[PDB]
Design a protein around this nucleic acid. Sequence first.
RNA 1: ACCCACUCGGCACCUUACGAGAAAUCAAAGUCUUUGGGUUCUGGGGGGAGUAUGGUCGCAAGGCUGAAACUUAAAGGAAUUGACGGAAGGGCACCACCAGGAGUGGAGCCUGCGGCUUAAUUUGACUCAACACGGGGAAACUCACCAGGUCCAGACACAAUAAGGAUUGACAGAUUGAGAGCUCUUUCUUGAUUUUGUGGGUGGUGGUGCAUGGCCGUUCUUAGUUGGUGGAGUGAUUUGUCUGCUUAAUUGCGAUAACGAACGAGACCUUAACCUACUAAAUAGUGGUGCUAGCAUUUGCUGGUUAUCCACUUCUUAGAGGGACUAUCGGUUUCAAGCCGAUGGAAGUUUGAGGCAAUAACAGGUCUGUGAUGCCCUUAGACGUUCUGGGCCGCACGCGCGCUACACUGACGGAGCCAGCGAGUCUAACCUUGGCCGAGAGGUCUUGGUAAUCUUGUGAAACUCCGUCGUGCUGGGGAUAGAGCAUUGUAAUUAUUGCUCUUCAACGAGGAAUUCCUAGUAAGCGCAAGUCAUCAGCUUGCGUUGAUUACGUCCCUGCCCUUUGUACACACC
Lengths: 71, 64
Amino acid sequence: KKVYTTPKKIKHKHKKVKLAVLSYYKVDAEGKVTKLRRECSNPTCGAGVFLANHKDRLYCGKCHSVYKVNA
Amino acid sequence: QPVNDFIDTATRHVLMRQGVLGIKVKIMRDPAKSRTGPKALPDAVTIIEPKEEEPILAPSVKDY
RNA sequence: ACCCACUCGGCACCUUACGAGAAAUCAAAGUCUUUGGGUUCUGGGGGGAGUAUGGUCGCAAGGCUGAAACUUAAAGGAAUUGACGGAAGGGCACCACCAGGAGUGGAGCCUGCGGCUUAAUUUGACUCAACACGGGGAAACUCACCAGGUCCAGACACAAUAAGGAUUGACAGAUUGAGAGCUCUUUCUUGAUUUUGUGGGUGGUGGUGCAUGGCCGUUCUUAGUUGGUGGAGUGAUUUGUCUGCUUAAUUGCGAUAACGAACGAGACCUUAACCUACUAAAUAGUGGUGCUAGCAUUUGCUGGUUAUCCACUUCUUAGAGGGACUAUCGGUUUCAAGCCGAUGGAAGUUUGAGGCAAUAACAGGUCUGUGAUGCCCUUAGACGUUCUGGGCCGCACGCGCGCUACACUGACGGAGCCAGCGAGUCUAACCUUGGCCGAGAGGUCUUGGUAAUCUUGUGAAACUCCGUCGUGCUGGGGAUAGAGCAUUGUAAUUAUUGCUCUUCAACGAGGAAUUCCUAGUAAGCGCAAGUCAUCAGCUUGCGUUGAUUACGUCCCUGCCCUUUGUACACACC
Ligand SMILES: [Mg+2]
Ligand SMILES: [Mg+2]
Ligand SMILES: [Mg+2]
Ligand SMILES: [Mg+2]
Ligand SMILES: [Mg+2]
Ligand SMILES: [Mg+2]
Ligand SMILES: [Mg+2]
Ligand SMILES: [Mg+2]
Ligand SMILES: [Mg+2]
Ligand SMILES: [Mg+2]
Ligand SMILES: [Mg+2]
Ligand SMILES: [Mg+2]
Ligand SMILES: [Mg+2]
Ligand SMILES: [Mg+2]
Ligand SMILES: [Mg+2]
Ligand SMILES: [Mg+2]
Ligand SMILES: [Mg+2]
Ligand SMILES: [Mg+2]
Ligand SMILES: [Mg+2]
Ligand SMILES: [Mg+2]
Ligand SMILES: [Mg+2]
Ligand SMILES: [Mg+2]
Ligand SMILES: [Mg+2]
Ligand SMILES: [Mg+2]
Ligand SMILES: [Mg+2]
Ligand SMILES: [Mg+2]
Ligand SMILES: [Mg+2]
Ligand SMILES: [Zn+2]
């Protein structure tokens, strides 16, 4: 046939990062637990799932993408 | 045409370790038994066997 | 000198063969396992090799005598069947010629092939038997090629990671051809479905058709293949299965150590031909009747009316029969199979045309039709797959199949007006009548048809008729090109196709060469079907008009058959 060429630079993949995440949740001196990161008002996501904090952005991940709640 | 009428054919690809073979089988059914169709080859022409005659015997006639 | 009968001894031929031989053959090559008349000479697998050596003869060249080492499983003989030949004898055929037809070869373009060019211009096939072939008419697709971007659709098994998260996904932005979370920023989400590793799979229009199946083409427009009982031979084998004649035919007559049979040919089947005989038909058509229009009127003539009724089956349809067997008669011939002519006949060239098709052969073609397939290659920066775009069409030129032409048997413009084989739409947008609108291409409103019921009588084309042009590259010819309009499609630029205007090339019958063909054939002519969203200058069939010339031969070419040679048999590659 021919075999191989390339101007170099191959592509990678994705990592899914690490993070021991959900410490986000503050409970006071025994034992009242208040929530950080506001949750989702889309009935497909029973207010368990949260909103990521970017710029302008507060976005619902479980809604694999859907809907822009901005506060 | 008798082909259509009388011989069954079949091919089967047998698949073995080294390559594959062709099986080809041909059966020719006795046309005598044909049951529904021609009972012999279009070839076939039987002559029916006569009958020895004891003729002569001067005229005469029977009555009933 | 001749003739006729005998008889010795010669050179030989013939037929037999009691007999001999491995056989071909042999009156000796016989009288040999039933082995002995007398005598001479030579051989003991093949090569080494008539070589080395010594002797000897010769002027010489060389003659006579004449080893071994080593190597090697065959060398050899006669006969058989094949296969082949640049031997000989017969045939057969418009993929051969003859007698001719219509041409290709010359030109323009269409299309395939080479070549060149190219990021790539995907690839198979190269005499008949590659080259309008792969049903190959590629805008995406197809697609195999090239420029780039995703995805795993990596079964299963073990291991590893790991519920404190094995893994999944993405809004915006960056990025990208892209409203691909491809990747990155950022930080949610997901929950044991994956992910990393090895082993093992899987896909592949990746290789190999010189590993295969299957299919197909070619030999083959051919006529060949085999067994029973007998005859010959130790045997392989042979004869049957052949000089001739005949046929399209190992088709037959005939000859005859063969008789009588089977596969293949023929039979058979399909379609085109013929039935005033049979069964019938408002999905086919005829006559009569009403209802009714036009013209004549003296009755008449020509139409309308999917049922206003009656009848019929000539035409159409398809069931069942019938029909032809080269019949009658005559010429010709071994008075055989046959062949030829006349009459009759729907039909008398295998009735015309197809379908089917024995044994064998080919390193024919096809792994690119197949979830047919061995083995090799590859398998996540993929040769898997998909998405975006290009390419197969690229243009100094060589080859092939075609289309259109060079006009006056014509082009043009009116007008006449006639086929057959097909095909059509359900979970859908196929075939389209009719009404309008538009010069046209087309558009728009409806409509009949899953169909002998509707498109459609497919009112097709050559053609026929009356005019115009008048031999002038002309009103023949329509290449190339400009500008505009429409149709198919997500997309038309490198211009899918259709229409209009303009532009108006080559080509004045085509060198050497070479193709096809014998009657509803050739040739001219259009149609339907395949392909198909759109596109036929292709193909498969169809009918329309309808000739000239053979009714022969072996000159060319091709091939079969004998005969013959063979040291070939993996068979002249
Ligand atoms: Mg000639
Ligand atoms: Mg000529
Ligand atoms: Mg074309
Ligand atoms: Mg090849
Ligand atoms: Mg593509
Ligand atoms: Mg693996
Ligand atoms: Mg492995
Ligand atoms: Mg495959
Ligand atoms: Mg082959
Ligand atoms: Mg093959
Ligand atoms: Mg012929
Ligand atoms: Mg014997
Ligand atoms: Mg013979
Ligand atoms: Mg009738
Ligand atoms: Mg006559
Ligand atoms: Mg080959
Ligand atoms: Mg195949
Ligand atoms: Mg091409
Ligand atoms: Mg051709
Ligand atoms: Mg005209
Ligand atoms: Mg207009
Ligand atoms: Mg309807
Ligand atoms: Mg002109
Ligand atoms: Mg013109
Ligand atoms: Mg068509
Ligand atoms: Mg084609
Ligand atoms: Mg011989
Ligand atoms: Zn949500």
